[PDB]
């Protein structure tokens, strides 16, 4: 409930961006950047409990995979925005 739940919740947060319309560039951009920054600060905070061991722990691997998921969610939004041929969204 201190590391694993926050990491899973930020990954599920990044996976909310997929259900928002592609035209909402600011909203999905802030989604991705906020999730990435939250993942970064979570990774930094998690290491503070245990010593400065050189090797990577299982928490480190779980955090790395969650980081890859949120980073890839933002990369996916960037890819979607690359092919976004129009600015105006659906109306009426």
């Amino acid at each position: 409930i201190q590391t694993y739940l926050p990491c899973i919740m930020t990954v599920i947060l990044s996976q909310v961006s997929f259900w928002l319309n592609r035209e909402s560039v600011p909203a999905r951009t802030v989604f991705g950047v906020t999730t990435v920054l939250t993942m970064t600060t979570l990774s930094i905070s998690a290491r503070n409990s245990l010593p400065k061991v050189a090797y990577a722990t299982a928490m480190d691997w779980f955090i790395a995979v969650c980081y890859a998921f949120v980073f890839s969610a933002l990369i996916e939004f960037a890819t979607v925005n690359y092919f976004t041929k129009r600015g105006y969204a659906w109306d009426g």
């Binding site: 560039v25 600011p26 951009t29 802030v30 950047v33 906020t34 990435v36 920054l37 970064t40 990774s43 930094i44 290491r47 010593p51 400065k52 061991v53 050189a54 090797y55 990577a56 480190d60 980081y67 980073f71 933002l74 990369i75 960037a78 925005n81 690359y82 600015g87």
Partner: protein, 333 residues
């Protein structure tokens, strides 16, 4: 019980009329005090206090004609309290900040009288020795931390130090497992340090610790590299998306400077610029230049070619960042 009475008589003779205030061979040649260390562990190597906690079995061996016996063949291992009734060298660690002999169960001392007069006197000492570290290449730095054993009151005309067993005097250094350090080398030096009161013998036990870089990739380098790669995403967003690109830029810049400040607050307030500081500032240059690249794009547009600038940045930023990494890691590794 007869041998018990014999040993009691021998030790009573040894302690009878024994002047603890006078060293062996007082008014004579200096007494040769050999030393040998058994490094139990090295812990708390902290740059904030510029010190390291060293636990060790510190043994000193010295001849003493007053403590010579020949009736008993075996070596007498006496209770540690007898150390209070015997002359022992007044050695100290010049860079020690806080030291103690371990307390439980009893005073962690050993006294062993040999028939020839040799006294093996051992202590289990936990000392927080001062090590002034040069963090200019931190975390890719080798630290030369020393322990300076010296006789406080007796000059070289009254005492001599030597590593008993030469390079084999200090043992157990290889078995030490520091969390973020690797002890690549250790050396033993014998010196004669001159103060205004005279010349004193000196033993310098120096460990050249090498800092492990793996942890700093996990906590320091990789997050900043990822943030720079994230800041590169703004180049892939069209210039009209002012809110998105500006938010990406400012979030990345602020998180970069926050990371730098948070890391540097833990470390001491050293004036010079470290290697981690060098990398963080370099990547702050990249992310701030990404934000200023969007700024230039916006000014050039509002105030084809702008797509040219955006596209050229889109490929040159990762290339220049990779060459910055090449130069940095080649210089420091």
């Amino acid at each position: 019980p007869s041998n018990m009475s014999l040993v009691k008589e021998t030790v009573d003779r040894l302690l009878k009329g024994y002047d603890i205030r006078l060293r062996p061979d007082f008014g004579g040649p200096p007494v040769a005090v050999g030393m040998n260390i058994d490094i139990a562990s090295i812990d708390m190597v902290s740059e904030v206090n510029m010190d390291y906690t060293l636990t060790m079995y510190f043994q000193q061996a010295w001849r003493d004609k007053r403590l010579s016996y020949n009736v008993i063949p075996l070596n007498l291992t006496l209770d540690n309290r007898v150390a209070d009734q015997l002359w022992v060298p007044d050695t100290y660690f010049l860079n020690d900040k806080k030291s103690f002999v371990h307390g439980v169960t009893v005073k962690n001392r050993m006294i062993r009288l040999h028939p020839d007069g040799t006294v093996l006197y051992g202590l289990r000492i936990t000392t927080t020795a001062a090590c002034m570290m040069d963090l200019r290449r931190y975390p890719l730095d080798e630290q030369n931390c020393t322990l300076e054993i010296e006789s406080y009151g007796y000059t070289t005309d009254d005492i001599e130090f030597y590593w008993r067993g030469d390079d084999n005097a200090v043992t157990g250094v290889t078995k030490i497992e520091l969390p973020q350090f690797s002890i690549v080398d250790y050396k033993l030096i014998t010196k004669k340090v001159v103060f205004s009161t005279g010349s004193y013998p000196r033993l310098s036990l120096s460990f050249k610790l090498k800092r492990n870089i793996g942890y700093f990739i996990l906590q320091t380098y990789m997050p900043s590299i990822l943030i720079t790669i994230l800041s590169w995403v703004s180049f892939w967003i069209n210039y009209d998306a002012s809110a998105a690109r500006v938010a990406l830029g400012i979030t990345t810049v602020l998180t970069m400077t926050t990371i730098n400040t948070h890391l540097r607050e833990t470390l001491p307030k050293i004036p010079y610029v470290k290697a981690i500081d060098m990398y963080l500032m370099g990547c702050f240059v990249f992310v701030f230049m990404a934000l200023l690249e969007y700024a230039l794009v916006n000014y050039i547009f509002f105030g084809t070619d702008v797509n040219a600038i955006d596209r050229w940045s889109r490929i040159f930023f990762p290339v220049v960042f990779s060459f910055f990494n090449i130069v940095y890691w080649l210089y420091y590794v």
